[PDB]
Amino acid sequence: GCARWCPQNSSCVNATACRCNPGFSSFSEIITTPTETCDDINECATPSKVSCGKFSDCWNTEGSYDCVCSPGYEPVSGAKTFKNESENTCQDVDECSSGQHQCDSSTVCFNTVGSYSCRCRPGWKPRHGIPNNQKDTVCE
Amino acid sequence: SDCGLPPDVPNAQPALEGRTSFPEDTVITYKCEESFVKIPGEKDSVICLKGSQWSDIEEFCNRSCEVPTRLNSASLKQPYITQNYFPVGTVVEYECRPGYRREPSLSPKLTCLQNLKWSTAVEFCKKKSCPNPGEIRNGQIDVPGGILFGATISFSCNTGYKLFGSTSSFCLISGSSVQWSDPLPECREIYCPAPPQIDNGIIQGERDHYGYRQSVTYACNKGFTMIGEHSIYCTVNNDEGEWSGPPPECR
Ligand SMILES: *[C@@H]1O[C@H](CO)[C@@H](O[C@@H]2O[C@H](CO)[C@@H](O)[C@H](O)[C@H]2NC(C)=O)[C@H](O)[C@H]1NC(C)=O
Ligand SMILES: *[C@@H]1O[C@H](CO)[C@@H](O)[C@H](O)[C@H]1NC(C)=O
Ligand SMILES: *[C@@H]1O[C@H](CO)[C@@H](O)[C@H](O)[C@H]1NC(C)=O
Ligand SMILES: [Ca+2]
Ligand SMILES: [Ca+2]
């Protein structure tokens, strides 16, 4: 048969009960009354066995979870979303050899981990109040 | 060309994986261990650089509540479903479920407290009320619970009437608002089959239809006895119409 009163995220198994879709959890395994609800599970939040890994953030979605490499890093394989740690391929951006930095002429692009900074050109003096080796460095 | 032990990040622990020394370009990731979770975009690992140099990591864990509580009244609004980090003071919205309505005096919000526990949930969404059931002419209705969403009402006919409809009716989500599964049934009175016509006996006051508890009266013709067998009345059993005794006889 088939049930005609299932909630938002279930499939009719018998005419008397429903079953939660994958990615969604219920407090019972058979949904007897329609006042019970299926809710989305938090694959990202604690405690979740799945861990995305390095330089990667988890993003809970309805019926799914997505790992993506944090900004300042990129995947090698181009594949943005992955499922557990063994698929992590996140690598730091060379912001220097890409030219998409914001240091000025008095400085030089300095590739770091997830970002960059600005060092004085060899033979250049940072103005006294400003600090060297930072994104707002000005030298003379 | 070598590496050494990784730093000690406060409130986090590295996954050494049983490595005494590390080659260059190896990377070890720290993990917030107890009550802490990672900031989005922060650096959770430190790679080993040339000359055994390790990258500097700012503390990237922070106090955090766990997942917003499961509520039967409502669910997390759409922006808030993706979030997995909840520092102290985090507000989250809520929207009422399919068969529920907002109680305007309350707040569709609850925030993270310094006890790493969410603020006490309130029932800011109450169940919808299906319309009033009405009244079955020549029939009863039993409302054991109430008209709120997800309650079944039963249907009953008065004696001598027969229902042609659904035994009960329950109220379920109907597009925007709630509504009853089954319309109101109809009670129709049972009719006794036909009045037997007596030989040499007139039947007083015939009507077009004869219902329940009705007694049909006989009289004998002139010169005929046994007018005192009385009359018969209309009885109904399990939807079948029966006359009580045999029809009286004229002699
Ligand atoms: C960790 O969480 C706390 C709040 O639980 C953040 O506190 C902020 O602190 C700054 C000053 O240091 C205040 O001006 C902000 O108003 C605070 N925000 C809140 C929501 O209380 C703290 O910054 C967090 N640490 C981070 C983000 O690294
Ligand atoms: C639902 O239907 C299946 C198959 O008809 C049955 O095995 C199961 O027991 C049913 N659930 C009940 C009766 O609660
Ligand atoms: C998790 O990673 C392991 C790596 O050993 C892989 O075999 C497995 O398929 C992954 N799990 C899922 C559900 O993809
Ligand atoms: Ca999910
Ligand atoms: Ca970089």
Tell me the C-alpha distance between A7 and A15, whole Å: 13
What number does CATH give the domain B12-63? 2.10.70.10
* Separation in Å, CA of A35 to nearest CA in chain B: 6
Class of domain B139-189: mainly beta
DSSP assigned state of B118: B
Q: Do B150 and A112 touch (CB under 8 A)?
A: no
Q: Do A54 and B82 touch (CB under 8 A)?
A: no
Looking at residue B108, its amino acid is P
> Does the CB atom of residue A16 touch ligand 2 within 6 A?
yes
Q: Do A39 and B67 touch (CB under 8 A)?
A: no
Question: Is B74-127 CATH 3.40.47.10?
Answer: no
Q: What are the C-alpha distances in Å from B104 to residues B118, B128, B204? A: 21, 14, 68
Q: Do B149 and A114 touch (CB under 8 A)?
A: no
Tell me the C-alpha distance between A138 and A8, whole Å: 58
- Coil, strand or helix: which one is A118? strand
Ligand nearest to the CA of A49: 3
Bond prior to A47 in cis (omega within 30° of 0): yes
A23–B contact, CB cutoff 8 A: no
> Does the CB atom of residue A33 touch ligand 2 within 6 A?
no
Atom of ligand 1 nearest to the CA of B114: 5
CATH topology agreement for domains B12-63 and B74-127: yes
User: Shortest CA distance to B5 belongs to which of B38, B35, B30, B40?
Assistant: B30
Tell me the C-alpha distance between A129 and A140, whole Å: 13
Looking at residue B129, its amino acid is S
Tell me the C-alpha distance between A23 and A104, whole Å: 49
Query: Burial code of B87-112, b = ≥16 C-beta within 10 A, e = fewer?
Result: eeebebebebbbbbbeeeeeebebeb
DSSP assigned state of A40: E
Tell me the C-alpha distance between A103 and A71, whole Å: 19
Tell me the C-alpha distance between A55 and B43, whole Å: 6
Please, which residues have CB within 8 angstroms of residue B138's CB and are 6 or more apart in sequence? B157, B158, B161, B187, B189
Q: Which two tokens stand for residue B191?
A: 């009719």
Q: Do A59 and B75 touch (CB under 8 A)?
A: no
Atom of ligand 1 nearest to the CA of B88: 5
Tell me the C-alpha distance between A79 and A89, whole Å: 9
State this model's resolution in angstroms.
3.2
User: Shortest CA distance to A109 belongs to which of A123, A95, A122?
Assistant: A95
* Separation in Å, CA of A70 to nearest CA in chain B: 5
Tell me the sheet residues that pair with B74. B96
* CA-closest residue to ligand 1 atom 7: B88
Residue B199 exposure: Cα atoms within 13 Å on the Cβ side: 1
> Does the CB atom of residue B43 touch ligand 1 within 6 A?
no
**Under 8 Å between Cβ of A28 and A19:** no
Q: What are the C-alpha distances in Å from B181 to residues A8, A13, A34, B133, B200? A: 18, 20, 12, 12, 56
> Does the CB atom of residue B89 touch ligand 1 within 6 A?
yes
Q: Spell out which residues of chain A touch residue B47, defining contact as CB-CB under 8 Å.
A: 113
Technique employed here was X-ray
